[PDB]
């Protein structure tokens, strides 16, 4: 029967206004969540974190946004070690699943050779493509790999249902990123389990106390986190905030 | 034709306003608006703040004056300004709003006899904002009867106001939905780009800053870069929106 | 469990219901929804506003002369759902077809209820054209405490409660954002709210038209639409304001 | 140099209702005009009128349509004989413009063997494929000819200039017809002349004190009457509107 | 309990070009399937094959588009008829359904009396005023009648299921014709059952090496493509390919 | 202001390539490229094959050649034939981009102080084509951080480049998604129609072929009537694509 695993590839090191706009300059550190559902028909892992070759050589697979972003994380929280450890071969997972294309959301691209690869057609396009400000947040090493297979989802496929049993569903939240999605999971004991992702990074975001300090647009973004506040209060669903350094250690990680 | 530089006092407000994410410490701005007188009749853009924020900024403009404090003096109000200069109410043909923000719907509804042309999805995004942009449009400005709107829609960019040149709405969408820059042409100077809120201050031209409030990163930065391709196949003198080092340094 | 109320009738002309079609006098019914449901109330756009049994000119200003509301002060949705059982806060979903004057009357008047409507209806409701800003009472929806969930334009079939109790069913044409309601009760079964959709038989028929509409391209394809949906389900279909019909429903 | 020819094709007779709606049942009768520009460059035909077969069978070339619009012409008056009779061969005729595709509008339609029937491509398509309100209203046996050249404007062709000298533009004005189009008209010596056509029947529509009887979509028609508001405004065009029995004596015919 | 019966209008005989785009000018022959599903409520016809007039005179009711495909069937195999030698009379169809509009899938239209036809509307309305280039490929006298009862369905109606219970879904996948559409089938025993139509015409363009020979969307033709392999490695359908001459007998 | 032609010498790839399912003989095309030379600066359009491609085709286009095979002087790269006439790098103002296929982007970068400009979907679709497309964009080409980009909206059509009608932008979408033609005007010549890749050859003009390279039919035959209403409008001398019959008939 399915399962929800939250993981981590360590911490990111910035300032508060990286994650609420214009907060204010201090040194600030924030987790990197990503998550595993183990299910019957198969494993799926939801963006993989920080690409492992930043435990190693950060500047070099990075580049410049390291001067904003400083990744601080161990070899072994690579997704794919983390998995190996936990009893999970690289080959034994059958989707990968991304909220969008950000660097540390595209540690798991390519890196399990058998996964479909889920994730709104307008991230992908916006990934290849991005704009002066964004440039730097997507990795080419990480999303652009001929040897992946993509399904690529389109504006009307809002909810889709990756098993079809209602087990884990795209969200879409645009705003954060143009095609950034968050996921409903539901789960046989906890039930509703609402991802967010970066829609919300904090409990400040979500009660409308914080702008994400990082946007494609604010319009969108702000409309997102209403649209999971309906969901949330329909569901009655556990919200996990993208990135909520305070909230982070009470769930089960 | 001429091109009057005015001014509506000043904003106090924090750097991050302005360049987003770029500190908390103390920072002013000049709240530009701008004449043209025309032949075929005079034209106000944007106005500045309303002249009521002059007096009671806490009553008229309520708790967004807690992030921009006005500083202007009743003088500075733009129907006061014009009447001051020649210019009674009457005798403004048309109003231009970049957008309807609240430093810059002092003249909405002014001016008795003036056509307010704008983007349609300013005024509509004006009349139902979200709850991040909603203190920063003033209903008692905007939201009036009386006042004739001419609404510009998506396939009426670069809209000649007089079918002579000389004034262009060139939209700019992103610091607002439906926010519009201007590019003047006069007999004498040739070519003024009005960048007004798509651009605040050099920074932001050289791509060194982003607006500190913004409804599309996106639109706003493909905005500066479509009016960099403007300035250079024009050779535009270009002005920029809130910037207290290049205000200074223009005809005002 | 599926109540149908109403909030007394309205006097108009009969072209305002059927375009074309004469001036004689004409009455219709305001109807109103109550759903009763074990996760919560639901209330679906609650009539014309209360204070419209006392002073319509008042409240409602010069589109009485189209629209003139008759109903008592106990007609009103929270005085007649308190009668019922109800009280204001054990209302948890005030559902919206649309923001027009006989279907406001419940907005705001439940403290804890989230409101859910079409995010285009909302948006051209606070910024409508001449011919329909009489129709939209901006003191019944313009609450800034009111807690609304603005539906998309993919959010067709929204499911309130996630069990195909009640389902939005977009229906644009009438009013922009207009929207009917699927139900689906355990021994009625499937329930068609056309609402505003299909004013009357003769509308559902094809043998009339709105006598006020945003769009007739929309308004037909969306009768059209509602159409194969009672083919489909084999829904009971109601009509929004049919005095023939409406007496031969089950009224609370 | 230049001149504008205002002709007509009879009348209709009809309903009030049908003009401003929900404005009563009484008997109304209006001129169905159309327009002749002559040019240097070549002979512009604007719609035609109504089929020069209304004026002998308009119930066989109509249809039932015929209780709505009743149709009192002679047969002279069809565009064809009219411009014989002024001294234009149909052979002689460069450009027919359609303001819109409605039984009252296509008379010249493929009656003129060279010339570019210019409109907008979206009412050409809604013309082929109607709703059930208004499928009366386009006389296939007008518009669906094969042997007609096209040139279908699309929603970024606003302002078409049919010359490239200023002296006839398409203005879009959709509500009344989805692809409805206006025509602003720059003569020598009267300056520019504003033909509304069916955006704006009548002064009353005009004064925004009348909706069309007819229409696709409200929204559209009163934004476009305002479109052309600012328009007349700017340029101080005569304002010549479609079917107005009142002001159409007025003008010169 | 509901079933899928594969039927067939014979063939046609084109050119491989046709089929795989810029393959070749060598002779080419392909099926023309059509399907049944027989549901408890109601019989459903998908397209119908060919028209059944076809048979007699092909040149005097395709016209000229008879010089790129010839039809190769006979009368028996006309929807009606066939229909008429399985079980099931003209008016016990209560649907037909359309992939699009193209003259091989339009042999059932209006040969039902009570079938409601359901297709995209921008199959219709493309089909109403084609490009140069494929109105020979819709043939009027199939589709344009006055007496066909139309569900069009919209942008939004992307998995329509036309009894509500999963056993027939549309499966928007534009590109081939503007509004084309394939099929998701779900039945007891078999389980699911995937009709790619001409989204997907052989096995080739199945995997990649080929592009169809008519289309209106190459763009949209390859992005269904990857549309329907995820739904295929999410369902494990089996595909049924809509022109294969190979493996259309593997099927039954 | 002066039109020069030039070419990159010749593409080798089939009939079928040009003109879709017309069979698969051997076939050569010019590689046309244009320079504006213009008091305000010089102009290169497109640029043709890259030089990389008459030393080393197989190395710098990869698998792709299997299919359009360059002849190619060096002497012909488009950097070079500007020297030998006398226009050094540096005095390019503008190089313009009809779309980013390998054969149209040999000036790319290749220029260091023009600015480019292409339609923003060109630019985009280029960064992220399908499949039956990634081999005719050229990474090396046109994916350079340096180069100064200005991408042109879907409002822009018609864009002026020195704005004074001696070069426009004459959006025709279809052979590739951002594609855009130029009519040129010339104070001897008149009006010249550069169709590039909306029409290869007069085939294609006369409606006797489609592309063998195609994003959309739809859009591209829909462009060539669009060319169609501006030749007759202007009286344009058209200038074709790929034409080998017809480009020996031109001023080379
Ligand atoms: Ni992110
Ligand atoms: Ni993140
Ligand atoms: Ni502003
Ligand atoms: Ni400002
Ligand atoms: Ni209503
Ligand atoms: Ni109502
Ligand atoms: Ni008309
Ligand atoms: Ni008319
Ligand atoms: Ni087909
Ligand atoms: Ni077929
Ligand atoms: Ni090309
Ligand atoms: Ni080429």
Redesign the interface.
Known sequence: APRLYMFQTGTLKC?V??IK??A??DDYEIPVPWYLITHPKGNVVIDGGCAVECASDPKGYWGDITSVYWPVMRIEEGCVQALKAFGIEPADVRYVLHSHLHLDHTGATGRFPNA?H?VRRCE??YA??P????AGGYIRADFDRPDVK???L???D?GYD???DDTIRFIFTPGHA?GHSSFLLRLPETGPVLLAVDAAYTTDHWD?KA?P?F??????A??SV??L??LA???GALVVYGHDPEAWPTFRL
């Open positions: 300032r206004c990286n706009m214009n204010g300059l479909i889920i992908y396009e290849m493509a704009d002066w400000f964004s993509w399904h690529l389109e504006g009307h809002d990756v098993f079809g143009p409308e702008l300090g946007l494609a647009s604010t319009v969108d702000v409309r209403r649209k506040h309906a209060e329909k569901t």
